Design a protein around this ligand. Sequence first.
Ligand SMILES: *Cc1cc2c(cc1C)nc1c(=O)[nH]c(=O)nc-1n2C[C@H](O)[C@H](O)[C@H](O)COP(=O)(O)OP(=O)(O)OC[C@H]1O[C@@H](n2cnc3c(N)ncnc32)[C@H](O)[C@@H]1O
Ligand SMILES: [Cl-]
Ligand SMILES: [Te]
Length: 385
Amino acid sequence: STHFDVIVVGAGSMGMAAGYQLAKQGVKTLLVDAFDPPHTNGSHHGDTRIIRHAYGEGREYVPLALRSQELWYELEKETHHKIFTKTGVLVFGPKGESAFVAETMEAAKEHSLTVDLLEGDEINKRWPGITVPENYNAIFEPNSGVLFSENCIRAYRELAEARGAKVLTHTRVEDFDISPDSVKIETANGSYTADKLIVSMGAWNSKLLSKLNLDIPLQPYRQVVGFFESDESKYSNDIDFPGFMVEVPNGIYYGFPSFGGCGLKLGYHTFGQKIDPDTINREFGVYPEDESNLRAFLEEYMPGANGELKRGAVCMYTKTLDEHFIIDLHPEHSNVVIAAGFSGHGFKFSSGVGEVLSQLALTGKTEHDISIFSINRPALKESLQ
Ligand SMILES: *Cc1cc2c(cc1C)nc1c(=O)[nH]c(=O)nc-1n2C[C@H](O)[C@H](O)[C@H](O)COP(=O)(O)OP(=O)(O)OC[C@H]1O[C@@H](n2cnc3c(N)ncnc32)[C@H](O)[C@@H]1O
Ligand SMILES: [Cl-]
Ligand SMILES: [Te]
């Protein structure tokens, strides 16, 4: 009995941001989620998320990163929940041996971002607790930082609902019915219709986009993080230890300073187990690599942050073949918007993406340049059934 202007399927990082953007404009919105966001079954838990501006994955992401940062600052002012702490973000790697570090540096130069360049012993001196070989160089971004992801989704949800958005929890959408002038979703708790549909199911996009006649390579990965007892006089946010994303011979790692003594948090970025979101084992430590891959990095580069394991979390990345996102209208339905394949680095952009999705759903276009995220790009290997 209830039609909506817009229906968002998957009220996580991207969906809830979109919900907020829509609700703020008086758009009657329905957000449907398989669980109760924020939760620990998707890709947004683990408390914290790094936001960087100078972007190693590609300088073309800078504009969206900057807009997102501005939106995070706006969110901070609108809710009592803590949103962002300006820890700054350190990026380092072997000199001349990191495409990631190099592109971060080019991105900063190209967009005139404020950064500090340092190398070798200067890194170890500036941040006691970090020990890199002398042949390593680095780019530090002072105005970047850490987002409290669960808080962000919780805030966006509370603000959206206050404005009329309805959130249907513990309801898994199982199928879609799209027509030229309307959209409909089917769930065990009933079906709903609207004029526009936003699809942002995270890791489940890899299993349910086929219901929209889409055939796109999307691989879900099991990615763990660990919190370790650390020397607080070196690794605390209070003594300015930074957030970081770095490249070493065996891959990329990312981490966060200890907040309120909860311990330095670390994650191994380039390796994870290929999994299915409905059968993934979400218990930290069941694979020996869960903990050993982390200590292998800590004992070598941040030796004072390699104490007892205080906490572990298991979460998922959803990768595209080129590791760039998918943000676009469905190729056969201009009334359907797709947000997928964030490949492990999309949370920092969720505020901006919420704005893009809102624009795409309401006008079929967006003021942002989102060409690099086209669902029709060849590197994606997109197809229909
Ligand atoms: C996992 C991970 C990711 C990560 C990170 C560390 C880890 C361990 N660190 C990051 C960082 O420092 N900086 C950054 O920018 N990103 C970082 N990431 C990646 C980021 O967290 C992910 O890209 C992001 O969270 C992706 O968001 P998305 O909105 O795609 O995924 P979600 O938050 O999981 O939300 C999806 C929601 O949809 C629901 N769902 C699923 N299936 C259904 C059905 N059938 N019906 C209805 N709802 C459905 C889920 O329940 C979920 O809430
Ligand atoms: Cl992801
Ligand atoms: Te703690």
